Short mmCIF file of C-alpha atoms and ligand atoms in Angstrom, two decimals:
data_model
loop_
_atom_site.label_atom_id
_atom_site.label_comp_id
_atom_site.label_asym_id
_atom_site.label_seq_id
_atom_site.Cartn_x
_atom_site.Cartn_y
_atom_site.Cartn_z
CA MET R 1 104.18 95.56 85.36
CA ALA R 2 104.67 99.29 86.01
CA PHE R 3 103.65 100.48 89.48
CA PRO R 4 102.16 103.96 90.08
CA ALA R 5 104.63 106.84 89.68
CA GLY R 6 105.55 107.71 93.25
CA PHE R 7 104.86 104.21 94.63
CA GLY R 8 106.66 103.68 97.94
CA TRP R 9 109.23 100.89 98.20
CA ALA R 10 110.40 100.32 101.73
CA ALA R 11 111.91 97.92 104.24
CA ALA R 12 111.20 97.66 107.99
CA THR R 13 112.92 96.98 111.31
CA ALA R 14 111.90 97.16 114.99
CA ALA R 15 114.03 98.54 117.81
CA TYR R 16 114.33 95.45 120.02
CA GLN R 17 114.86 93.22 117.02
CA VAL R 18 117.85 95.18 115.64
CA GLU R 19 119.28 97.74 118.04
CA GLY R 20 121.15 95.94 120.81
CA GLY R 21 122.61 98.46 123.28
CA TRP R 22 119.92 97.20 125.65
CA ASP R 23 121.38 99.09 128.66
CA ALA R 24 123.59 101.56 126.76
CA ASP R 25 123.62 105.25 127.73
CA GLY R 26 121.10 104.92 130.58
CA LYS R 27 118.44 103.09 128.57
CA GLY R 28 115.82 101.55 130.87
CA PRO R 29 114.89 97.85 130.63
CA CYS R 30 112.05 96.79 128.34
CA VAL R 31 109.95 93.66 128.79
CA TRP R 32 112.09 91.73 126.29
CA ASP R 33 115.25 92.48 128.29
CA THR R 34 113.61 90.94 131.35
CA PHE R 35 112.06 88.10 129.36
CA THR R 36 115.15 86.96 127.45
CA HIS R 37 117.42 87.27 130.49
CA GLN R 38 115.20 84.89 132.46
CA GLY R 39 115.97 82.11 129.96
CA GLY R 40 114.13 78.85 130.57
CA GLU R 41 114.07 77.97 126.86
CA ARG R 42 111.23 80.38 125.94
CA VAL R 43 113.47 81.76 123.21
CA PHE R 44 115.46 79.57 120.81
CA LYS R 45 118.76 78.63 122.54
CA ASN R 46 118.11 81.22 125.30
CA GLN R 47 119.10 83.94 122.85
CA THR R 48 118.63 87.63 123.60
CA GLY R 49 118.50 90.97 121.82
CA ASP R 50 121.34 92.32 124.01
CA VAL R 51 123.31 93.01 120.81
CA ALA R 52 121.10 91.73 117.95
CA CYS R 53 122.22 93.58 114.75
CA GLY R 54 123.94 96.25 116.83
CA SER R 55 122.00 98.95 114.99
CA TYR R 56 122.28 101.29 117.98
CA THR R 57 126.04 101.24 117.34
CA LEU R 58 126.00 100.59 113.60
CA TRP R 59 123.31 102.88 112.18
CA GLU R 60 125.77 103.97 109.45
CA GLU R 61 125.85 100.35 108.28
CA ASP R 62 122.04 100.24 108.08
CA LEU R 63 122.07 103.49 106.10
CA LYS R 64 124.49 101.89 103.60
CA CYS R 65 122.02 99.02 103.14
CA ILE R 66 119.08 101.41 102.72
CA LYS R 67 120.97 103.43 100.09
CA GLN R 68 122.03 100.26 98.22
CA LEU R 69 118.40 99.18 98.01
CA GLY R 70 117.31 102.65 96.88
CA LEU R 71 114.35 102.62 99.27
CA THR R 72 111.93 105.53 99.00
CA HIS R 73 110.76 104.95 102.59
CA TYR R 74 112.22 103.26 105.66
CA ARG R 75 110.18 101.93 108.56
CA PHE R 76 111.75 101.72 112.02
CA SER R 77 110.58 101.89 115.63
CA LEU R 78 111.44 104.12 118.57
CA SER R 79 112.47 102.37 121.78
CA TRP R 80 110.21 103.78 124.53
CA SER R 81 112.57 102.56 127.26
CA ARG R 82 115.57 104.04 125.41
CA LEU R 83 113.95 107.47 125.20
CA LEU R 84 112.21 107.46 128.60
CA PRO R 85 114.02 104.94 130.85
CA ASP R 86 111.10 104.88 133.32
CA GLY R 87 108.40 105.26 130.65
CA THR R 88 107.69 108.90 131.58
CA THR R 89 109.05 112.31 130.57
CA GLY R 90 110.29 112.95 134.14
CA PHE R 91 113.68 111.77 132.85
CA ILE R 92 114.73 112.04 129.19
CA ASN R 93 117.66 110.09 127.71
CA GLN R 94 119.20 112.65 125.36
CA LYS R 95 121.45 110.06 123.71
CA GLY R 96 118.23 108.24 122.79
CA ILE R 97 116.89 111.41 121.14
CA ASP R 98 120.22 112.03 119.37
CA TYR R 99 120.23 108.47 118.01
CA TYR R 100 116.77 108.70 116.41
CA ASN R 101 117.35 112.24 115.18
CA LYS R 102 120.46 110.97 113.40
CA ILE R 103 118.39 108.23 111.70
CA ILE R 104 115.74 110.72 110.63
CA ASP R 105 118.19 113.38 109.45
CA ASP R 106 120.30 110.84 107.55
CA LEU R 107 117.21 109.41 105.85
CA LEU R 108 115.97 112.82 104.75
CA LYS R 109 119.33 114.03 103.43
CA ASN R 110 119.29 110.87 101.27
CA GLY R 111 115.69 111.41 100.07
CA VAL R 112 114.26 108.54 102.12
CA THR R 113 110.97 109.12 103.96
CA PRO R 114 110.79 107.82 107.56
CA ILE R 115 107.77 105.77 108.65
CA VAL R 116 108.04 105.65 112.43
CA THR R 117 106.53 103.12 114.81
CA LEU R 118 106.16 104.46 118.37
CA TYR R 119 105.72 101.12 120.07
CA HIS R 120 106.68 97.69 118.71
CA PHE R 121 106.04 94.94 121.30
CA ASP R 122 108.59 96.52 123.69
CA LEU R 123 106.99 98.13 126.76
CA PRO R 124 109.30 99.64 129.38
CA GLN R 125 109.53 97.16 132.25
CA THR R 126 108.46 99.88 134.71
CA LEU R 127 105.13 100.20 132.88
CA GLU R 128 104.56 96.45 132.69
CA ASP R 129 105.14 96.30 136.46
CA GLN R 130 102.42 98.96 136.72
CA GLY R 131 99.93 96.66 134.90
CA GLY R 132 100.99 96.96 131.27
CA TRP R 133 98.05 96.80 128.86
CA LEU R 134 95.90 95.16 131.53
CA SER R 135 95.50 98.40 133.54
CA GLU R 136 93.82 101.73 132.62
CA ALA R 137 96.95 103.71 133.60
CA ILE R 138 98.68 102.62 130.38
CA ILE R 139 96.37 104.83 128.29
CA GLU R 140 97.68 108.13 129.67
CA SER R 141 101.24 106.74 129.78
CA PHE R 142 101.03 105.92 126.08
CA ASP R 143 99.35 109.20 125.12
CA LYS R 144 102.07 111.17 126.92
CA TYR R 145 104.81 109.12 125.22
CA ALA R 146 103.14 109.69 121.82
CA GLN R 147 102.99 113.46 122.40
CA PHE R 148 106.66 113.47 123.40
CA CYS R 149 107.49 111.63 120.15
CA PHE R 150 105.32 113.92 117.99
CA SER R 151 106.89 116.98 119.66
CA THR R 152 110.49 115.74 119.32
CA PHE R 153 110.50 114.22 115.84
CA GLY R 154 107.29 115.33 114.09
CA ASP R 155 108.85 118.42 112.52
CA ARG R 156 110.49 115.87 110.18
CA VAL R 157 108.48 112.66 110.57
CA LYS R 158 105.10 112.73 108.81
CA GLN R 159 104.00 109.08 108.82
CA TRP R 160 103.39 107.36 112.13
CA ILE R 161 102.42 103.90 113.34
CA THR R 162 101.35 104.26 116.96
CA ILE R 163 101.26 100.59 117.90
CA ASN R 164 102.68 97.65 115.94
CA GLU R 165 100.07 94.87 115.56
CA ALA R 166 97.88 95.50 118.61
CA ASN R 167 96.08 92.27 117.63
CA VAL R 168 99.19 90.07 117.81
CA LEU R 169 100.37 91.85 120.97
CA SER R 170 97.04 91.30 122.75
CA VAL R 171 97.12 87.60 121.97
CA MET R 172 100.81 86.85 122.41
CA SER R 173 101.57 88.95 125.49
CA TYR R 174 98.27 88.81 127.35
CA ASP R 175 96.18 85.84 126.24
CA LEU R 176 98.62 83.05 125.39
CA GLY R 177 101.48 84.54 127.40
CA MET R 178 104.03 83.48 124.79
CA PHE R 179 105.52 87.00 124.74
CA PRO R 180 106.41 88.98 127.90
CA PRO R 181 105.16 89.07 130.50
CA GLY R 182 104.63 85.66 129.66
CA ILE R 183 101.61 84.63 131.82
CA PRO R 184 98.71 82.73 130.20
CA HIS R 185 95.22 84.24 130.54
CA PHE R 186 93.30 82.13 127.98
CA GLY R 187 90.13 83.82 126.73
CA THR R 188 90.46 86.75 129.16
CA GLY R 189 93.75 88.67 128.93
CA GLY R 190 93.62 89.27 125.17
CA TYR R 191 90.32 91.17 125.19
CA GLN R 192 91.31 93.23 128.23
CA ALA R 193 94.58 94.30 126.58
CA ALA R 194 92.82 94.90 123.24
CA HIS R 195 90.41 97.30 124.92
CA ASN R 196 93.22 99.44 126.38
CA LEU R 197 95.32 99.27 123.18
CA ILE R 198 92.36 100.61 121.18
CA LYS R 199 91.69 103.40 123.71
CA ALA R 200 95.40 104.35 123.86
CA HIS R 201 95.65 104.46 120.10
CA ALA R 202 92.55 106.67 119.78
CA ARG R 203 93.85 108.98 122.53
CA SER R 204 97.19 109.40 120.75
CA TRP R 205 95.38 110.12 117.45
CA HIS R 206 93.34 112.85 119.13
CA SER R 207 96.52 114.29 120.65
CA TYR R 208 98.05 114.37 117.17
CA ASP R 209 94.93 115.84 115.60
CA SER R 210 94.52 118.60 118.20
CA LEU R 211 98.13 119.52 119.00
CA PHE R 212 100.34 118.57 116.06
CA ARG R 213 98.47 118.04 112.79
CA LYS R 214 97.94 121.69 111.82
CA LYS R 215 101.67 122.47 111.90
CA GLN R 216 103.19 119.05 111.09
CA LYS R 217 100.65 117.93 108.44
CA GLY R 218 101.36 114.23 108.81
CA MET R 219 99.20 111.21 109.35
CA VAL R 220 98.80 108.54 111.96
CA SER R 221 97.64 104.96 111.98
CA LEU R 222 98.23 101.67 113.81
CA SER R 223 99.35 98.48 112.07
CA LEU R 224 97.28 95.32 112.08
CA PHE R 225 98.46 91.78 111.36
CA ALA R 226 96.22 90.06 108.83
CA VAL R 227 96.10 86.42 107.79
CA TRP R 228 93.91 85.93 104.73
CA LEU R 229 91.32 83.23 105.44
CA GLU R 230 89.39 80.82 103.22
CA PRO R 231 86.77 78.14 104.01
CA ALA R 232 88.38 74.69 104.33
CA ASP R 233 85.48 73.25 102.35
CA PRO R 234 84.46 75.93 99.81
CA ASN R 235 81.03 74.26 99.44
CA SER R 236 80.35 74.39 103.20
CA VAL R 237 78.15 77.29 104.38
CA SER R 238 79.42 76.80 107.95
CA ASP R 239 83.04 76.97 106.71
CA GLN R 240 82.23 80.03 104.58
CA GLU R 241 80.72 81.81 107.61
CA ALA R 242 83.54 80.57 109.85
CA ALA R 243 86.25 82.03 107.57
CA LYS R 244 84.51 85.44 107.50
CA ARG R 245 83.98 85.31 111.27
CA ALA R 246 87.69 84.50 111.74
CA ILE R 247 88.64 87.56 109.66
CA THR R 248 86.22 89.59 111.78
CA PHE R 249 87.72 88.27 115.05
CA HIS R 250 91.42 88.87 114.28
CA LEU R 251 91.32 91.96 112.06
CA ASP R 252 87.97 93.77 112.25
CA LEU R 253 87.91 93.52 116.05
CA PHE R 254 90.45 96.37 115.97
CA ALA R 255 89.70 98.01 112.64
CA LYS R 256 85.92 98.38 113.01
CA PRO R 257 86.04 100.58 116.13
CA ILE R 258 88.93 102.71 114.81
CA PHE R 259 87.87 103.10 111.15
CA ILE R 260 84.07 102.70 111.25
CA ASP R 261 82.00 103.41 114.36
CA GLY R 262 84.00 103.11 117.60
CA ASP R 263 82.58 99.72 118.57
CA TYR R 264 83.47 96.04 118.17
CA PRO R 265 81.87 93.82 115.50
CA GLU R 266 78.42 92.56 116.48
CA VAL R 267 79.37 88.91 115.92
CA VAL R 268 82.38 89.34 118.22
CA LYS R 269 80.23 90.88 120.97
CA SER R 270 77.47 88.27 120.59
CA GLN R 271 79.80 85.21 120.48
CA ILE R 272 81.86 86.22 123.52
CA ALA R 273 78.77 87.31 125.51
CA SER R 274 77.00 83.99 124.83
CA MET R 275 80.08 81.92 125.79
CA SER R 276 80.73 84.06 128.86
CA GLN R 277 77.19 83.61 130.16
CA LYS R 278 77.41 79.80 129.74
CA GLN R 279 80.75 79.83 131.58
CA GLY R 280 79.20 81.52 134.64
CA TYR R 281 80.46 85.08 134.21
CA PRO R 282 78.07 87.86 135.32
CA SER R 283 79.46 90.01 132.49
CA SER R 284 81.03 89.35 129.08
CA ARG R 285 84.77 88.68 128.85
CA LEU R 286 84.73 91.32 126.10
CA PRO R 287 84.75 94.76 127.76
CA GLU R 288 82.20 97.36 126.64
CA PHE R 289 82.94 100.81 125.27
CA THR R 290 80.75 103.55 126.73
CA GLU R 291 78.93 105.77 124.23
CA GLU R 292 81.48 108.54 124.87
CA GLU R 293 84.35 106.08 124.26
CA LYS R 294 82.71 104.99 120.97
CA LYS R 295 82.57 108.67 119.90
CA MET R 296 86.23 109.16 120.86
CA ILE R 297 87.51 106.00 119.13
CA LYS R 298 85.58 106.38 115.85
CA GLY R 299 87.65 107.69 112.94
CA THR R 300 91.08 107.65 114.58
CA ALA R 301 93.21 106.44 111.66
CA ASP R 302 94.39 108.39 108.64
CA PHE R 303 95.30 105.36 106.52
CA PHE R 304 95.12 101.57 106.74
CA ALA R 305 98.37 99.91 107.79
CA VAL R 306 98.35 96.17 107.27
CA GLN R 307 101.02 93.50 107.80
CA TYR R 308 100.57 90.38 105.68
CA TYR R 309 102.59 87.16 105.65
CA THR R 310 100.32 84.17 105.10
CA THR R 311 96.91 82.55 104.57
CA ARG R 312 94.98 79.74 106.35
CA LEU R 313 91.99 77.49 105.77
CA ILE R 314 89.17 77.79 108.32
CA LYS R 315 86.79 75.11 109.56
CA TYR R 316 83.74 75.69 111.77
CA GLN R 317 84.37 74.09 115.16
CA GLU R 318 81.43 74.21 117.58
CA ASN R 319 82.38 75.02 121.16
CA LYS R 320 80.24 72.14 122.43
CA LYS R 321 82.03 71.93 125.80
CA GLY R 322 82.03 75.70 126.43
CA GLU R 323 85.83 75.77 126.67
CA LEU R 324 87.59 79.04 127.42
CA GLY R 325 89.73 80.67 124.72
CA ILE R 326 89.66 82.92 121.65
CA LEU R 327 89.44 80.14 119.04
CA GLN R 328 86.58 78.68 121.08
CA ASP R 329 84.82 82.07 121.19
CA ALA R 330 85.12 82.30 117.40
CA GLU R 331 84.15 78.61 117.01
CA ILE R 332 86.80 77.95 114.39
CA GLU R 333 89.94 75.91 113.75
CA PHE R 334 92.71 76.86 111.32
CA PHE R 335 95.15 74.83 109.25
CA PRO R 336 97.10 75.12 105.99
CA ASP R 337 96.37 73.55 102.61
CA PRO R 338 98.78 70.57 102.30
CA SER R 339 99.95 71.85 98.89
CA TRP R 340 101.44 75.12 100.24
CA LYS R 341 105.18 75.52 100.91
CA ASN R 342 106.34 76.91 104.28
CA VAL R 343 109.07 78.02 106.65
CA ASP R 344 107.64 77.76 110.18
CA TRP R 345 104.21 79.49 110.26
CA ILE R 346 104.83 81.42 107.03
CA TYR R 347 103.00 79.40 104.39
CA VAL R 348 103.60 80.89 100.95
CA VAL R 349 100.23 82.02 99.60
CA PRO R 350 100.91 85.17 97.53
CA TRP R 351 97.32 85.50 96.27
CA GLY R 352 96.23 85.98 99.90
CA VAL R 353 97.56 89.55 99.76
CA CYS R 354 95.32 90.38 96.78
CA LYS R 355 92.22 89.01 98.52
CA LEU R 356 93.21 90.93 101.66
CA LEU R 357 93.74 94.23 99.87
CA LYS R 358 90.34 93.91 98.13
CA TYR R 359 88.76 93.08 101.50
CA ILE R 360 90.27 96.23 103.04
CA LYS R 361 89.05 98.34 100.10
CA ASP R 362 85.52 96.88 100.31
CA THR R 363 85.24 96.98 104.10
CA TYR R 364 87.02 100.23 105.01
CA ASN R 365 85.73 102.66 102.36
CA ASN R 366 88.63 102.41 99.92
CA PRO R 367 91.33 103.79 102.25
CA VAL R 368 94.95 104.66 101.58
CA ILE R 369 96.78 101.40 102.29
CA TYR R 370 100.36 100.93 103.46
CA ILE R 371 101.64 97.37 103.72
CA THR R 372 103.93 98.08 106.67
CA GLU R 373 105.31 94.50 106.74
CA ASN R 374 105.50 91.57 104.35
CA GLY R 375 108.28 89.04 103.84
CA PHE R 376 109.67 85.52 104.00
CA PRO R 377 112.13 83.88 106.38
CA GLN R 378 114.91 81.43 105.67
CA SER R 379 115.98 78.81 108.19
CA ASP R 380 119.39 79.34 109.73
CA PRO R 381 121.70 78.88 108.09
CA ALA R 382 120.50 80.40 105.05
CA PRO R 383 121.99 80.62 101.53
CA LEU R 384 123.11 84.07 100.33
CA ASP R 385 121.89 83.20 96.83
CA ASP R 386 118.26 82.87 97.95
CA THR R 387 116.66 82.35 94.54
CA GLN R 388 113.76 80.31 95.94
CA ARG R 389 112.79 83.03 98.42
CA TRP R 390 113.09 85.68 95.73
CA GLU R 391 110.50 83.79 93.65
CA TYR R 392 108.07 84.15 96.60
CA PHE R 393 108.66 87.93 96.56
CA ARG R 394 108.18 88.12 92.76
CA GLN R 395 104.88 86.25 93.04
CA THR R 396 103.78 88.58 95.85
CA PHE R 397 104.66 91.67 93.77
CA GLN R 398 102.58 90.31 90.87
CA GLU R 399 99.64 90.04 93.28
CA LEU R 400 100.19 93.62 94.50
CA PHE R 401 100.14 94.74 90.89
CA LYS R 402 96.87 92.84 90.35
CA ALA R 403 95.33 94.50 93.43
CA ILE R 404 96.24 97.94 92.09
CA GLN R 405 95.38 97.33 88.44
CA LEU R 406 92.36 95.02 88.53
CA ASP R 407 90.88 95.88 91.93
CA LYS R 408 91.91 99.58 92.05
CA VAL R 409 93.16 99.23 95.62
CA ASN R 410 94.87 102.38 96.86
CA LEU R 411 98.10 100.71 97.90
CA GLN R 412 100.72 103.48 98.23
CA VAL R 413 103.61 101.85 100.13
CA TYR R 414 105.04 98.35 100.34
CA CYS R 415 107.43 97.59 103.24
CA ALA R 416 109.58 94.46 103.22
CA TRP R 417 110.13 92.79 106.60
CA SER R 418 113.11 93.00 107.13
CA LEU R 419 116.06 95.17 106.19
CA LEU R 420 118.21 92.85 108.22
CA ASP R 421 118.21 89.38 109.65
CA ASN R 422 117.29 90.07 113.24
CA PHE R 423 116.00 88.82 116.59
CA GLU R 424 112.82 87.04 115.52
CA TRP R 425 111.19 87.08 118.98
CA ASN R 426 110.85 83.51 120.35
CA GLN R 427 112.67 82.12 117.29
CA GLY R 428 115.73 84.23 118.13
CA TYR R 429 118.27 84.28 115.29
CA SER R 430 117.07 80.94 113.85
CA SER R 431 114.62 82.68 111.50
CA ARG R 432 116.21 85.03 108.95
CA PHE R 433 113.84 87.58 107.37
CA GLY R 434 116.45 90.07 106.17
CA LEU R 435 117.19 91.37 102.71
CA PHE R 436 120.65 91.64 104.24
CA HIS R 437 122.36 88.74 105.98
CA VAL R 438 123.83 89.47 109.43
CA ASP R 439 126.55 87.36 111.07
CA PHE R 440 125.54 87.27 114.76
CA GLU R 441 128.71 85.34 115.68
CA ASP R 442 130.88 88.24 114.47
CA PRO R 443 131.26 91.13 116.95
CA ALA R 444 131.14 93.62 114.04
CA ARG R 445 127.75 92.20 112.91
CA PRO R 446 128.57 92.55 109.18
CA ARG R 447 125.69 93.05 106.73
CA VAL R 448 125.88 91.28 103.34
CA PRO R 449 123.14 91.32 100.67
CA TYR R 450 121.09 88.25 99.88
CA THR R 451 120.20 87.86 96.21
CA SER R 452 116.75 89.19 97.19
CA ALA R 453 118.39 92.53 98.10
CA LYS R 454 119.88 92.86 94.61
CA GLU R 455 116.63 91.80 92.96
CA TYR R 456 114.54 94.15 95.11
CA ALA R 457 116.81 97.08 94.22
CA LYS R 458 116.11 96.29 90.55
CA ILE R 459 112.32 96.32 91.13
CA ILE R 460 112.64 99.69 92.90
CA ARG R 461 114.86 101.15 90.14
CA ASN R 462 112.42 100.06 87.43
CA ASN R 463 109.39 100.80 89.64
CA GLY R 464 107.99 97.40 88.76
CA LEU R 465 108.45 93.95 87.31
CA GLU R 466 109.03 92.20 83.96
C1 LIG K 1 99.69 82.47 111.67
C2 LIG K 1 98.32 81.80 111.55
C3 LIG K 1 97.34 82.42 112.53
C4 LIG K 1 95.91 82.12 112.09
C5 LIG K 1 94.89 82.70 113.06
C6 LIG K 1 93.56 82.89 112.34
C7 LIG K 1 92.38 82.73 113.29
C8 LIG K 1 91.86 84.10 113.72
C9 LIG K 1 90.94 84.00 114.92
C10 LIG K 1 91.44 83.66 116.28
C11 LIG K 1 92.67 84.31 116.89
C12 LIG K 1 93.40 83.33 117.82
C13 LIG K 1 94.91 83.33 117.54
C14 LIG K 1 95.68 82.12 118.09
C15 LIG K 1 97.03 82.01 117.35
C16 LIG K 1 98.07 81.02 117.96
C17 LIG K 1 99.46 81.56 117.56
C18 LIG K 1 100.63 80.78 118.15
O1 LIG K 1 100.47 79.74 118.83
O2 LIG K 1 101.80 81.19 117.96
C1 LIG K 2 92.11 90.22 121.00
C2 LIG K 2 91.84 88.91 120.27
C3 LIG K 2 91.76 89.12 118.76
C4 LIG K 2 92.51 88.02 118.02
C5 LIG K 2 93.67 88.61 117.21
C6 LIG K 2 94.52 87.49 116.62
C7 LIG K 2 95.71 87.99 115.80
C8 LIG K 2 96.40 86.83 115.08
C9 LIG K 2 97.29 86.02 116.03
C10 LIG K 2 98.46 85.35 115.29
C11 LIG K 2 99.81 85.58 115.97
C12 LIG K 2 101.01 85.17 115.07
C13 LIG K 2 102.35 85.70 115.61
C14 LIG K 2 103.55 85.47 114.64
C15 LIG K 2 104.89 85.60 115.43
C16 LIG K 2 105.70 86.83 115.04
O1 LIG K 2 105.14 87.91 114.73
O2 LIG K 2 106.95 86.79 115.03
C1 LIG K 3 85.50 86.06 143.95
C2 LIG K 3 85.78 85.38 142.61
C3 LIG K 3 84.72 85.70 141.56
C4 LIG K 3 84.90 84.79 140.35
C5 LIG K 3 83.61 84.07 140.00
C6 LIG K 3 83.79 83.07 138.85
C7 LIG K 3 83.25 83.63 137.54
C8 LIG K 3 83.07 82.54 136.50
C9 LIG K 3 84.34 82.29 135.70
C10 LIG K 3 84.69 80.81 135.68
C11 LIG K 3 85.27 80.40 134.32
C12 LIG K 3 85.25 78.88 134.14
C13 LIG K 3 83.82 78.36 133.98
C14 LIG K 3 83.77 76.87 133.64
C15 LIG K 3 83.67 76.65 132.13
C16 LIG K 3 82.32 76.12 131.71
O1 LIG K 3 81.44 75.81 132.54
O2 LIG K 3 82.06 75.98 130.49
O1 LIG K 4 107.49 87.25 112.43
C1 LIG K 4 107.92 88.23 111.52
C2 LIG K 4 107.42 89.59 111.96
O2 LIG K 4 106.00 89.49 112.04
C3 LIG K 4 105.23 90.54 112.61
O3 LIG K 4 104.14 89.90 113.24
C4 LIG K 4 105.95 91.45 113.63
O4 LIG K 4 105.49 92.79 113.51
C5 LIG K 4 107.48 91.46 113.52
O5 LIG K 4 108.05 92.05 114.67
C6 LIG K 4 107.99 90.04 113.30
O6 LIG K 4 109.39 89.99 113.30
#
C-alpha cells in the first residue's frame, strides 16, 4: 500500500499536556494550573501538568524522538499564558517566544514542517476570570493573540490550527463542566461557548487573510473532534436519522457555518428551538448569528482538520420529559457495539475513519484533509513491546489507504496522537498515548520508544504498508 508521494506523516502534542514549566520564566497561570492545583479528585490521583513530560526544559529530547521517527510534519501548540502571561500583548514573555522559535527553527533545519495550534484547551486564567468563552470579550482577545502569533512565527510557520476541538471544549469546559472552569451548565453553556468559539475563529481567519496571507502564504483551519456514528439498528429509520442527526450535532454544528454558509444546521436550530420553547425560554438556547455574522463566518477555513479516535452506535431517544441537555436536544443515546475492543472511551473501530473521511469529502466539497490527531492509549503501566496497539494502527492505516485509493479523499497529512505519553487531562498519566514512553517518576523524564514508534518509522520510511 503506497501512499501519495509527499504524504505527510506526523505526530502531535499540546502545550499543557507536555511542557511542564507551568510558572517558569514569568509564565502566567492557565485554567489547567488552577484546576489541577485545586485537587478534589477531578484528575486521576490529583495529578497535575506542573512538570508533565518537561518539554519546556527538554525540547532537545523531543527533537531526538521526532528525528528517530522521521516525521515530515510535527504538530504542537503554543501556550497563550506562556507567551502573554495576562492574555494580552501589554506584556510579552520573551523566553516564551525564544522557546517556540527554537522548536520551529530546529524543525525546519531538520526538514520537518511545523503545524501549530494556537489554543489547545488552555486559556490564560486571567481571561477565564473575564468570562472565558461565555463572554463576547474573548473574541477580540483571541483575535489579538492570533495576530501576535502570526506576526511572531508566521514567517516560518505556514500551517495553523486556531483552536483545538472547539466542539469538545464547548462541551467539556462549558456544558458538562468536566474541564476547567469546571461548572456544569447542562444544555446552556455549550452552545454559548460554541457561538463565541466560532466567531473568534472566523475573526482570526480574517486577520490572517487580510494582514498575513499575502506575504506568509500559509493556511489556517480549526480542528474538530469527530466520532463516526452508525444506527444501532441498521433497519430502523429512526436510528438511521438519529445517527445522521448526531453527526450533524457534534461535527457539522461547527463545520457548516465555517465551511458552508456561516449558519448552524437547520436540524440543530429547529431541535433546540422546539425544546427551548417547551422548557419556558422566551428565546432558543442556541444563539443566533446575525446576517452580517453569517457573511463574516462563511468560508473561514483553508482545509479540513479532523481528529478521529472512535465510533459509536446511535439510538433514537425521544425527549418525552423535555429534559435539559445536549443529548436530549439531539434526541439520541450512544453506546458501543459489544464486539469492539477498548481502552477507556477509545473503542477500536478503524473503519470509522474511512466512513468519516468519505463523509467529509461528500459534505464539505472535497476539501484538503489533515487528520491532526488519531491514536490509541495503553493503560498504565504499559508494555514497551506494544504489539497489540500497533495492530490497531496498522488497521487504521489500511483504512486511510482505502479512503485515498477507493474514495479519492484528499487526505494530505496524518498526525499520530501522541509523540509522548503525556498528561491526558482528567485521566492524568494513567492513559498513555505516546509513541514514546515517558517515566513520570524519574526527574529526567526519559523518553523510550514503544514498538509502535519503531513500526511507525518503518511506515514513514517506506511511505506505506505491506
Ligand atoms: C467518545 C464518544 C462520544 C460520542 C458522542 C456522540 C453524540 C454526539 C451528539 C451529542 C454531543 C453530547 C456529548 C456528550 C459526551 C459525554 C462525554 C463525557 O462524559 O466524557
Ligand atoms: C456545542 C455542542 C455540540 C456537541 C459537540 C460534542 C463533541 C463530542 C463530545 C465528546 C467529548 C469526548 C472527550 C474525550 C476526552 C479527551 O479528549 O481527552
Ligand atoms: C429573572 C430570571 C429569568 C429566567 C426565567 C426562566 C426561563 C426558563 C428556563 C427554565 C428551564 C427549566 C424549565 C423546566 C423544564 C421543562 O419544563 O421541561
Ligand atoms: O484524549 C486523547 C486526546 O483527544 C483529543 O480530544 C484532544 O485534542 C487531546 O488533547 C487528547 O489528549
